[PDB]
Design a binder for these strands. Sequence first.
RNA 1: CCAGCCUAAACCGUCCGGCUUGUCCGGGCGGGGUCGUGGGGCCCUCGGACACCGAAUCCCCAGCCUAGCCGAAGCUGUUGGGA
Length: 73
Amino acid sequence: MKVILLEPLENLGDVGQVVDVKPGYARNYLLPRGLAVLATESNLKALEARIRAQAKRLAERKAEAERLKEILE
RNA sequence: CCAGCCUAAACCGUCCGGCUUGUCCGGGCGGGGUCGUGGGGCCCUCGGACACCGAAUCCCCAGCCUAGCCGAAGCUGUUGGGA
Ligand SMILES: [Mg+2]
Ligand SMILES: [Mg+2]
Ligand SMILES: [Mg+2]
Ligand SMILES: [Mg+2]
Ligand SMILES: [Mg+2]
Ligand SMILES: [Mg+2]
Ligand SMILES: [Mg+2]
Ligand SMILES: [Mg+2]
Ligand SMILES: [Mg+2]
Ligand SMILES: [Mg+2]
Ligand SMILES: [Mg+2]
Ligand SMILES: [Mg+2]
Ligand SMILES: [Mg+2]
Ligand SMILES: [Mg+2]
Ligand SMILES: [Mg+2]
Ligand SMILES: [Mg+2]
Ligand SMILES: [Mg+2]
Ligand SMILES: [Mg+2]
Ligand SMILES: [Mg+2]
């Protein structure tokens, strides 16, 4: 199953990564112990938000320190 | 015998809570949509209100069921216990 781990996992990977693992492992350990979440079409969408949001969030914080770069120099 | 309709989804709006506050996620309500000569959504150009079609829902009556009522024309003999 496709899941989205919200935790630095050893064999799996870092947070926010999407990796397919054996059902039982996620169904009876990851998902239950809150290490990951079933990567449904609903969650993948809510992940595009965390990506795009923080993206233009720092992309705009650098686009603002872009004005101070032009003038303070 | 006779007859065809409603919805899910896209898409727009709202109220609620969840949470990593986000152009989001889900839930409930409303609008939209309903088809095979393919249809619908959103974006453009246009004439439609006063156009027409119209119930399987509601309303009035007719009619009918549950009691009834009117309804023509004869009398004398005669056998017989009795016409
Ligand atoms: Mg959904
Ligand atoms: Mg959605
Ligand atoms: Mg509806
Ligand atoms: Mg929806
Ligand atoms: Mg929804
Ligand atoms: Mg909603
Ligand atoms: Mg739904
Ligand atoms: Mg519903
Ligand atoms: Mg409707
Ligand atoms: Mg429309
Ligand atoms: Mg409709
Ligand atoms: Mg239409
Ligand atoms: Mg059909
Ligand atoms: Mg089409
Ligand atoms: Mg009519
Ligand atoms: Mg009546
Ligand atoms: Mg009567
Ligand atoms: Mg007599
Ligand atoms: Mg007599």
